[PDB]
Each structure stands twice: as structure tokens, then as C-alpha cells.
Design a protein around this ligand. Structure first.
Ligand code: FAD
Ligand code: FUM
Ligand code: F3S
Ligand code: FES
Lengths: 119, 130, 243, 577
């Protein structure tokens, strides 16, 4: 009927990340996409604000190093946890999807980490 | 030998197309994709930025591609969509009693939006005013 | 006066005779006060005595009239023909097995509710001592979550329960949550394993539709999310218990 | 039939039945208790109750006041040793429910609140907000889940009990989904099946309150007691007959005719009280009967507003304002909005009096036991002797837990001391049910039960209502005997086995007919007016204690006749004069 001694799901763990990640993309992603994806390429920024030279200064600041990391990393966790479940909802069987999606998240997190310790 | 022959209706993968309410949920969950895609683009940036002005500029030339622009508009639209639903969903996770009543989410939604507004502004100030 | 009729299509299904359910059609008179339940009874009285369906109260409180109406979960006793002039198709409550006509097998529901032990646990107070003290504020914690008439419209509405039939489900989770949030209950530990399961709160992807259909405005979606928070507090604490 | 063996078998899983199970489980941890119910326990009519449950809690109240209110409310047809036991046990059981998790409405200090009901001077009604029955029921059902002694037979329609040599040995029931027969053997049986208000065309009751339980008792020579006393509620929606809680009037709503006249000051319940300030016993808070009778008077006069669904007075709650409505009366507002289409905020609710509660029921002693040893009754299907000619508002919920408890324990003792019956005789009994069942299935004739149903309901409204006459009572008696005949000519066309409701509904109709006959007979013979039983004829318009201070007992013989005897009413400390 219903398992008497059912196993504790590991799900709290990913869902926690995805909570932190989701809140971040909610609050901060729109302005970021706006700056990076719209202003930067359309040169719709005043002077030399988004010049190669200026970015690097921020990128390479400690604050930037953390900010860029989280800007990249948190949305992946929220993002991919969502896609993990979208397979199920769409009824798509992916082998070790838990391994696939969270694995991908971990690969990227580490890469990003590497980037913000610099290459 | 029962005479019962329980008929079990099938649940297909087109199930969510039916109800408009299901469609929207799928859509809300769709925001995940461009979200992940923007994180991808950011990684290229972190690294073209790493590999010097040569690469960084070939990056900016990429964003400057008219299709990458359209993807990115959509991408930010998705983000607003996510933001919009996140703030409606998130509050149901709290149980706060004010004056003997369980508060609704509306106060919270307002705050998440206010803080989003400020943040959006402060970043734009910081990013652009120097 | 002359009463306008309505051609209602009800999906019939005898397991002795039928291979699969199939739709019949009935012409039913109505006015502005005529509920589906009224019309169901009418079909049964004068046209199809073999029409089998559940009901009792007629005021949407026993929670027994639950069925699909144009693909939305509803209480027949609270669904009105006037609201369906274009057409009305009546099916058995979705996500449950059809036993016969509009009667479905509630067992998992029932089994689910039972699994979370919805009763005060480990208060030792005895009646001769009089009652526990609970303040309007203390109640306001769970009160709404205690409004569940056990209809199961949540279960028809939840795509997650459809996909995974072992999901203990919105109501059951709500009901566990209701007891967990009672100042007078000391039994949270005894309901946690169910909720911590993957067949617990962790099957919900917050589709939310449950709470759209609750005819009693219980808002089971909120209870589940609050449950995820509790499940997540729980998991952490378990992780820090070396003992 | 498959045979199940239990120590106790309880028929009916409403407030009273659940409370009897729990008591039985607690009285003996080892016992196998068979809790049976044609519907799932949470669907029982107990769930619809909204006013509340009475239990003396306030410092100024006394058990003597609750005792007094009850006897007087009952016009002295109450069994005073029963009323005494009841008032004293009431506080215990409302507290136990609170212990069990019932969300009674609370005071700021966190103590439970009470409100006024049923015209009692001192407030003593606990309320779980506007859903007191919902809460009592679900609390009891859920609490019952913890006890593994109770084995429920959900959605099992009990057909008959088994009695040999003056003792009850079990019962035969149908698994409604499987369409199969089962036989539970138990040396004690409790009937907790609810009232019989569905023999009326218009009532407040669920479809399941059809008197099945009272019928079974008639079958075996147990009389139903005080059946003519059928409580009406003054304010029910037209057609549906859905209840508008008294609380509407506790909250100070008003009742008015087509001229918007608050007509009740003219029927002895004057003077009018200001809209803000409602006084108990005056106007809309006047005596229940008087208010129903008032509606009848207004009707004769041509003062009732005519509608498609019927003649009504209006229940005006407009002067309560949106806020007041929500905090104290939200459900009424949904009900009104939904079933009559009236936003109470902007509009007046049409109301009509509607059949509501069954004071009569299976005769029981003070332990809830009947004349058949081991056979017990509790709840609205019974006659403990609590309500006489008129139940008190909010006394029915209290009784369910007070006497449901008593019954559970008493039945448990009786089971413990029963000793064995004659096996061949018992299964001979069991085959009898099965045989008798096939008979009804093979029965032929082309009568639509639904019409007989309808026709029964009509005769009850017309001939057995608020005011009563010997013409109409006789017409109803006569109609009913005609319906009994026609009932033998009913063909049950559906032959399915899997949730076949045509057949179950047809059985319930059969019980109804039997029961109504008892009611109609009881009333015709009661040449007096007392409580709910009010007659217009010369020399019958007043209460009669020289001659009528006794309970009607109605027996039904094998020949299909309804015979009456009379029993004396027990007085302890409160005689009339
Ligand atoms: C709308 C409304 C509001 C009310 N409000 C109040 C109030 O505020 N305060 C108050 O004190 N009283 C109130 N009453 C009256 C009171 O609720 C009832 O008198 C009381 O609930 C009866 O409960 P019960 O245990 O006797 O049985 P019920 O609750 O009637 O349950 C009977 C049980 O019997 C079972 N059953 C019946 N037939 C069979 C069968 N053949 N086989 C198997 N099982 C069977 C059913 O399935 C059910 O589980 C109200 C009544 C109504 C209609
Ligand atoms: O709540 C009511 O109005 C009815 C009360 C009662 O029947 O006891
Ligand atoms: S629809 Fe299902 S996904 Fe959760 S929000 Fe309700 S239980
Ligand atoms: S009959 Fe009770 S829910 Fe509709």
C-alpha cells in the first residue's frame, strides 16, 4: 500500500540549491541579461563602461570574482534541476538523469570556479 | 473471482497541452532552459575575457550576432517570467501569523519586487555610470 | 413555464459488459438552480436507472460528488447546468481507476491519508484536567489546512499523481502538515518519514492546480511547500546527528 | 457467504458510530471491532452540522440548567434519568474531542469559546467555527485510525441483523463494490445509522439518511419510539431544503415577509428589537416551533413571497456588512450565493421551514440497549429518552459522543458475557436475508421506485408537517399503505453487481415506507399537541398530561401492520404542572 520505512529522499539537497538559485535568477538575472545581452552588443552604454578594459577590472576584483561565479553557477542549479524534472513530466527516459543533470551542473560549477580563480 | 474490471485511463506525454493551466506550468518550467543558456554564455565571457582582447572582442561580436540578440531578448523575457512566478510561488513556503491571521503572499510579493527594482537600478548605476 | 433542456454526455462503464468506458447522452431539463447532481439524479430516475454515482450532502460538505466536468475536477453538487450551455461532458474522477460509471477506487487516497497518522500524538493531557490552551494565533497556523472534505479533486488535478501513482498526494500531505502545525500535537517525528520519501512532498513540482480546484480553499499547494521546508529542515538535522 | 468474526459490530460510522468504536477499542485493546458503513465515514450527515455541540463550561452555568433546558425543551417527554447522565457527561466528551484535536473556536486567553443556541439562557455550545460537524466527524474518524482494533467495512450496506432466541448474533451486509454478501458474527451490535429525514420531500439531510437502521429494528419486533416528533428547521433554502444555520439569526439577521414586515412580533414574540441588538427568546431568536408556525400563518394570510421553487419569507442579513459575514458566517454566504444565487451582502435569502431532525428512533434503555439482548442503538436512529418531543439546538452532536461512548462500553461488556448461540439457527437467519434479497431482485412489476419515493415525500410534507389535521394525517396514512402495495410491484431493472445503486436505493425506499408509517401512525393517535407535534383539531390543540404524558411505541408485525403501545415517562426531580 504505502511503504512503512520509506527511504528519505535526497531531494532536499538539490531543491535547496535550486531555491537559492531560483531566487537569484529572479532578482538579478533580468538586469544582467539586459546589460550583457542587450546593452553591451548594441553599444548602448555610456562611454567606456563596458569596455574590455573595464570588465576585466570588475571581473578581476574579488567582488566581481564572487559575483560572476554566483551569477553563473546558481542559475545552473535552479535551471538544470528544472530540466531534470521536465524529462519526467514530458515522460522522457534519460539514464541516470540524476547523474546527467547534476553531473553537468557540477562540471560547470567547477569550470566557472576555475574561471574565477582565473586561467 | 471478482466481477470488477477496474478501468485505468492512460496518462500520456501530451497531457499538459490539454488544460491551459498546465500549459502555463510547462512554460514557467520552460524558463529554466534559457536560464541555463545565459549561464553558458557567461562562461564563454569569463573565458574570452581570460584569453585577452582578441577573444573578448570575438565574444562581443558573437552577442552582436542578430540571432543571438533575438535569443537573448527571449532569454530576458523568460527571466522576467521566471521572476514573476517565483515571487508568487515563493511566499507559500512561509507561514506567518500577523494579529491572529495567516498573512497572504501579497506583502511578500511586493517586497520581492521592490528589492528586485532597487537591485536592478543599483546594478545599472554601478555598471554604467562609471 | 417550459424548461429548457440540456444534452449532457455522461461517460458510462459497466465492467461486466464493457471493454472500455463509452459516452451516453441524456436530455435534462433545467433552470438557473439546477446542479449536475440534480441532473444526475434525474437521469437516474427517468432514463438510466443503472446510472451509478456517489453523493450525499448536496451542499458540498461531505465531499462525495467528485467528478470531471469538461475536464475540470468538480463537485457535481456545486456545478450548475446553466454554466454549461455549449455542452457538458461528465467523466469519472481522473487519476483513479474506474470501477463503474462515475465511481472510482478511492483506496490509495484512503491508504494515503492513513499513512501519515492524522491524529494527535503524544499529548498526555487528560480530560479531567480540562482542555489544552490554544490561542487564535496558534490555530491560525493550521486552521485552513484543516478544511479538507477529502473530495480528492486535488488528486484528479495533480499531474504528478497521475504520473506517479504512489505519490501520497496534496490532501494527504496537507493533512499531515495540519497535524504537524498543531500546538497540541507532539508527533511530527512520526509523520516525517512519509513526507521525506520521494513519494512524499518531493514528488510535487508545484504545479499548483490542486489548489485551484479545492472547493474548500484549503490551498494544499501551500501546505506541500511548507512541507518541503520542513522536510528540508529535517534532512539537515538528520545529517548533523552523529549520535 | 464469506464469514467474518468480530467481538463488536457497529453499523454506521458517523459521530456516534465512530465514538462507539473508539470507546470499544479503548475498553478492550484485544477486541476485533467491525465498523460498517454504506458510505465512507467522512461522508455521514454528521459532517454537515454547523451550529455546535452543547456542554456546560461557563462558571455561571450549572448542570441543572442544561438539565432543565432539555426537559422543558422536550415538553416533558424526556427520560429524566437519561438527561441527568447526559448533561454531566457532556463536558467530559467535548473536552476529549479537544484532546483529540478538534479545533473548537477559542477565546483570546486560549480557552474554548461558547455561543448561544436553541434558546438556552446560558451559552454552552462549543463551536468549531462554522463547521462544527465537519470537525467533530473528521476528528473522530482520524482518531479512530490510530486504533488497530477497529476494522472498517467501508461502503458495505447492511441488510439485516441476526437474532436467535432473543439475542443478536451478527449481521449480513453487502460489499457494495463487489456486489457480494458477507456475514459478520458478533455478539453485540450497535446501530448508529442516523435519522430518517429523507422520507420527507424537502429536508436538510444527506441522501443517506433513509432510516435503514430503524427499519431493521422494526423487522425484529423492536419498536421505534416517539416517531411523530419530527423537528423542522425554520430557515432552509427553497427546493433544496438546505439549512441556514440559526447562527444567521444569532448574528442578528431578520425575517420578513413580502411587505418587509418583521412579522414575528405579532405571534407573541414581540416586541421588535433594534437591528443592532438581538435579544434571546424575542423575535428571530424566539422559540423554534413558534417561528415555523409563524411562517405557516404568514402563508395563509398571503404574506409569503412566491417563487418558482416555492413560497418563502426572506432572511435579511444585509445589515451585517461584508466584514461581519466573513468572520462568523462564510459558509452560509457560499451556500446562498451558489444554491439560490444570492450574495447575502447585497440581498435577502429566501427561506422556508424544512424537515430536519428525527426525535423518534429505536427504543433503548439507559445503556442504549434494546429489547433484543446485545442489540444496541445510539444517535439519531435511536430513542435514548434524551429529547422527548423536541430536541434542543446543539444537543444532538453532544449526544453522539456522550452516548456513542456509553454504547461502545456497554456493548463491549455484553459481548464479553454473551456465550454461544445456536449456529444452525444463526445461519438459517443468514440464508433468510439472502433469500429475501433474491426475492426483491426477482420481484417484478414495472413500478419506478423513484415515483414511490417522490410520492412518499409528498405525503409526509402534506400530512405530517408543522400543523397537523386528522384529514391529512389519514390521507398520508392511506397514501403510504398504497405505496407499500406498489412497492411489491417494483422492478429493479439494473442487475449489475458492481456498485448497483438502483438496488440499494430501492432497499432504502423500502425502509422509508416502514418508518414513515410508524411516524404517520404515531402522530394520528397522539391526540394532543406537544412539541413538534402540533394539531389543529378541536380538543387536540394543547398538551395533555393527564392522558398524553407517555411515549408512543410503534411496532410493526409480520402481517405488515403498524401497532402502537404506550410507555411511561420517567420523572426524577422535575415534574410538570
Ligand atoms: C444540515 C444539518 C445541520 C445540523 N446541525 C446540528 C448542530 O449544529 N448541532 C447539533 O447538535 N445537531 C445538528 N444536526 C443534527 C445532528 O447532526 C444529527 O442528529 C447527528 O449528526 C446524527 O449523527 P449519527 O451518528 O446519528 O449518524 P449519521 O451521522 O447520520 O451517520 C450515520 C451512518 O450510518 C451509516 N449507514 C446508514 N445506513 C446504513 C446501512 N444500511 N448500512 C451501513 N451503514 C449505514 C452511514 O453510512 C453513516 O456512516 C444537524 C443536521 C443537519 C442535517
Ligand atoms: O445550526 C443550526 O441552525 C441547526 C442546529 C441544530 O440542528 O442543532
Ligand atoms: S498539482 Fe501537484 S505538483 Fe504539487 S502543487 Fe499540487 S500537488
Ligand atoms: S454531496 Fe456532499 S459533496 Fe456533494
Amino acid at each position: 500500500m504505502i511503504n512503512p520505512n520509506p527511504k528519505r529522499s535526497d531531494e532536499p539537497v538539490f531543491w535547496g540549491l535550486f531555491g537559492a538559485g531560483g531566487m537569484w535568477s529572479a532578482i538579478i538575472a533580468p538586469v544582467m541579461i539586459l546589460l550583457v545581452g542587450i546593452l553591451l552588443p548594441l553599444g548602448l552604454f555610456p562611454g567606456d563602461a563596458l569596455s574590455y578594459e573595464r570588465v576585466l577590472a570588475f571581473a578581476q576584483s574579488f567582488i566581481g570574482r564572487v559575483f560572476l561565479f554566483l551569477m553563473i553557477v546558481l542559475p545552473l542549479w535552479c535551471g538544470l534541476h528544472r530540466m531534470h524534472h521536465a524529462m519526467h513530466d514530458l515522460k522522457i527516459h534519460v539514464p541516470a538523469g540524476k547523474w546527467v543533470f547534476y553531473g553537468l551542473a557540477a562540471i560547470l560549477t567547477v569550470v566557472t570556479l576555475i574561471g574565477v580563480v582565473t586561467i | 473471482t471478482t466481477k470488477r474490471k477496474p478501468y485505468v485511463r492512460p496518462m500520456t506525454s501530451t497531457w499538459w497541452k490539454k488544460l491551459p493551466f498546465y500549459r502555463f506550468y510547462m512554460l514557467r518550467e520552460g524558463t529554466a532552459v534559457p536560464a541555463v543558456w545565459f549561464s553558458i554564455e557567461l562562461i564563454f565571457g569569463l573565458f574570452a575575457l581570460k584569453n585577452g582582447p582578441e577573444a573578448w572582442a570575438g565574444f562581443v561580436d558573437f552577442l552582436q550576432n542578430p540571432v543571438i540578440v533575438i535569443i537573448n531578448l527571449i532569454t530576458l523575457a523568460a527571466a522576467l517570467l521566471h521572476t514573476k512566478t517565483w515571487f508568487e510561488l515563493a511566499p507559500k513556503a512561509a507561514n506567518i501569523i500577523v494579529k491572529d491571521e495567516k498573512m497572504g503572499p501579497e506583502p511578500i510579493i511586493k517586497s520581492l519586487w521592490a528589492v528586485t527594482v532597487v537591485a536592478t537600478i543599483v546594478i545599472l548605476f554601478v555598471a554604467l555610470y562609471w | 413555464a417550459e424548461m429548457k433542456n440540456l444534452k449532457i454526455e455522461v461517460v458510462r462503464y459497466n465492467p461486466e459488459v464493457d471493454t472500455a468506458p463509452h459516452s451516453a447522452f441524456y436530455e435534462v431539463p433545467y433552470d438557473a438552480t439546477t446542479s449536475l447532481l440534480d441532473a444526475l439524479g434525474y437521469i437516474k430516475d427517468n432514463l438510466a436507472p443503472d446510472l451509478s454515482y456517489r453523493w450525499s450532502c448536496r451542499m458540498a460538505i461531505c465531499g462525495s460528488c467528485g467528478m470531471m466536468v469538461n475536464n475540470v475536477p468538480k463537485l457535481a453538487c456545486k456545478t450548475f447546468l446553466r454554466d454549461y450551455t455549449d455542452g457538458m461532458k461528465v467523466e469519472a474522477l481522473a487519476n483513479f481507476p474506474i470501477e463503474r460509471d462515475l465511481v472510482v477506487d478511492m483506496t490509495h487516497f484512503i491508504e494515503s491519508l492513513e499513512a501519515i497518522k492524522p491524529y494527535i500524538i503524544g499529548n498526555s493531557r487528560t480530560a479531567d484536567q480540562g482542555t489544552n490552551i490554544q490561542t487564535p494565533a496558534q490555530m491560525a497556523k493550521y486552521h485552513q489546512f484543516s478544511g479538507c472534505i477529502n473530495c480528492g479533486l486535488c488528486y484528479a488535478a495533480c499531474p504528478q499523481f497521475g504520473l506517479n501513482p504512489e505519490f501520497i498526494g496534496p490532501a494527504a500531505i496537507t493533512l499531515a502538515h495540519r497535524y504537524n502545525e498543531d500546538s497540541r500535537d507532539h508527533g511530527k517525528k512520526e509523520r516525517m518519514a512519509q513526507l521525506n520519501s520521494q513519494n512524499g512532498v518531493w514528488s510535487c513540482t508545484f504545479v499548483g492546480y490542486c489548489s485551484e480546484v479545492c472547493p474548500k480553499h484549503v490551498d494544499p499547494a501551500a501546505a506541500i511547500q511548507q512541507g518541503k521546508v520542513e522536510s528540508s529542515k529535517d534532512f539537515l538535522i538528520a545529517t548533523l546527528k552523529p549520535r | 457467504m464469506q464469514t467474518f468474526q468480530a467481538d463488536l459490530a457497529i453499523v454506521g460510522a458517523g459521530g456516534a458510530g465512530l465514538r462507539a468504536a473508539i470507546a470499544a477499542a479503548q475498553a478492550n485493546p484485544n477486541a476485533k471491532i467491525a465498523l460498517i458503513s454504506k458510505v465512507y465515514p467522512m461522508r455521514s450527515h454528521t459532517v454537515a452540522a454547523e451550529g455546535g455541540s452543547a456542554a456546560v463550561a461557563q462558571d455561571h452555568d450549572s448542570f441543572e440548567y442544561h438539565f432543565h433546558d432539555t426537559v422543558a425543551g422536550g415538553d416533558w417527554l424526556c427520560e429524566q434519568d437519561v438527561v441527568d447522565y447526559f448533561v454531566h457527561h457532556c463536558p467530559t466528551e467535548m473536552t476529549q474531542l479537544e484532546l483529540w484535536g478538534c479545533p473548537w473556536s477559542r477565546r483570546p486567553d486560549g480557552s474554548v469559546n461558547v455561543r448561544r443556541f436553541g434558546g438556552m439562557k446560558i451559552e454552552r455550545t462549543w463551536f468549531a467555527a462554522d463547521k462544527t460537524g465537519f470537525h467533530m466527524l473528521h476528528t473522530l474518524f482520524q482518531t479512530s485510525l490510530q486504533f488497530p482494533q477497529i476494522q472498517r467495512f467501508d461502503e458495505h450496506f447492511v441488510l439485516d441483523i441476526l437474532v436467535d432466541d432473543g439475542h443478536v448474533r451478527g449481521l449480513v451486509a453487502m460489499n457494495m463494490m463487489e456486489g457480494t454478501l458477507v456475514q459478520i458474527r458478533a455478539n453485540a451490535v450497535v446501530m448508529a445509522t442516523g435519522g430518517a429525514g429523507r422520507v420527507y420531500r424537502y429536508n436538510t439531510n444527506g441522501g443517506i439518511v433513509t432510516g435503514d437502521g430503524m427499519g431493521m429494528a422494526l423487522s425484529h419486533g423492536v419498536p421505534l419510539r416517539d416517531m411523530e416528533f419530527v423537528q423542522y428547521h425554520p430557515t432552509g433554502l427553497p427546493g433544496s431544503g438546505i439549512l441556514m444555520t440559526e447562527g444567521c439569526r444569532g448574528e442578528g439577521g431578520i425575517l420578513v415577509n413580502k411587505n418587509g414586515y418583521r412579522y414575528l412580533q405579532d405571534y407573541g414574540m414581540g416586541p421588535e428589537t433594534p437591528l443592532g441588538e438581538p435579544k434571546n427568546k424575542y423575535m428571530e431568536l424566539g422559540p423554534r416551533d413558534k417561528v415555523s408556525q409563524a411562517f405557516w400563518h404568514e402563508w395563509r394570510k398571503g404574506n409569503t413571497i412566491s417563487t418558482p421553487r416555492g413560497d418563502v419569507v426572506y432572511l435579511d442579513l444585509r445589515h451585517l456588512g461584508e466584514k461581519k459575514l466573513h468572520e462568523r458566517l462564510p459558509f452560509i454566504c457560499e451556500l446562498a450565493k451558489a444554491y439560490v444565487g444570492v450574495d447575502p451582502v447585497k440581498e435577502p435569502i429566501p427561506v422556508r421551514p424544512t424537515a430536519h431532525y428525527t426525535m423518534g428512533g429505536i427504543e433503548t434503555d439507559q445503556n442504549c440497549e434494546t429489547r433484543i439482548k446485545g442489540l444496541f442503538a445510539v444517535g439519531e436512529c435511536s430513542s435514548v429518552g434524551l429529547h422527548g418531543a423536541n430536541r434542543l439546538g446543539s444537543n444532538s452532536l453532544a449526544e453522539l459522543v456522550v452516548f456513542g461512548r456509553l454504547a461502545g462500553e456497554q456493548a463491549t461488556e455484553r459481548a464479553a458475557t454473551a456465550g454461544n448461540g445456536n449456529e444452525a439457527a444463526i445461519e438459517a437467519q443468514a440464508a433468510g436475508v439472502e433469500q429475501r434479497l433474491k426475492d426483491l431482485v426477482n420481484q417484478d412489476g414495472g413500478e419506478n421506485w423513484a415515483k414511490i419515493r417522490d410520492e412518499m415525500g409528498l405525503a409526509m410534507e402534506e400530512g405530517c408537517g408543522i400543523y397537523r389535521t386528522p384529514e391529512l394525517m389519514q390521507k398520508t396514512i392511506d397514501k403510504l399503505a398504497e405505496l407499500q402495495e406498489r412497492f411489491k410491484r417494483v422492478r429493479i431493472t439494473d442487475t449489475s453487481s458492481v456498485f448497483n445503486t438502483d438496488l440499494l436505493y430501492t432497499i432504502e425506499l423500502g425502509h422509508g415506507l416502514n418508518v414513515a408509517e410508524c411516524m404517520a401512525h404515531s402522530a394520528m393517535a397522539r391526540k394532543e399537541s406537544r412539541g413538534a407535534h402540533q394539531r389543529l383539531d378541536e380538543g387536540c390543540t394543547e398538551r395533555d398530561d393527564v392522558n398524553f404524558l407517555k411515549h408512543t411505541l410503534a411496532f410493526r408485525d409480520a402481517d405488515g401492520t403498524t401497532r402502537l403501545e404506550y410507555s411511561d415517562v420517567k420523572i426524577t426531580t422535575l415534574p410538570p404542572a
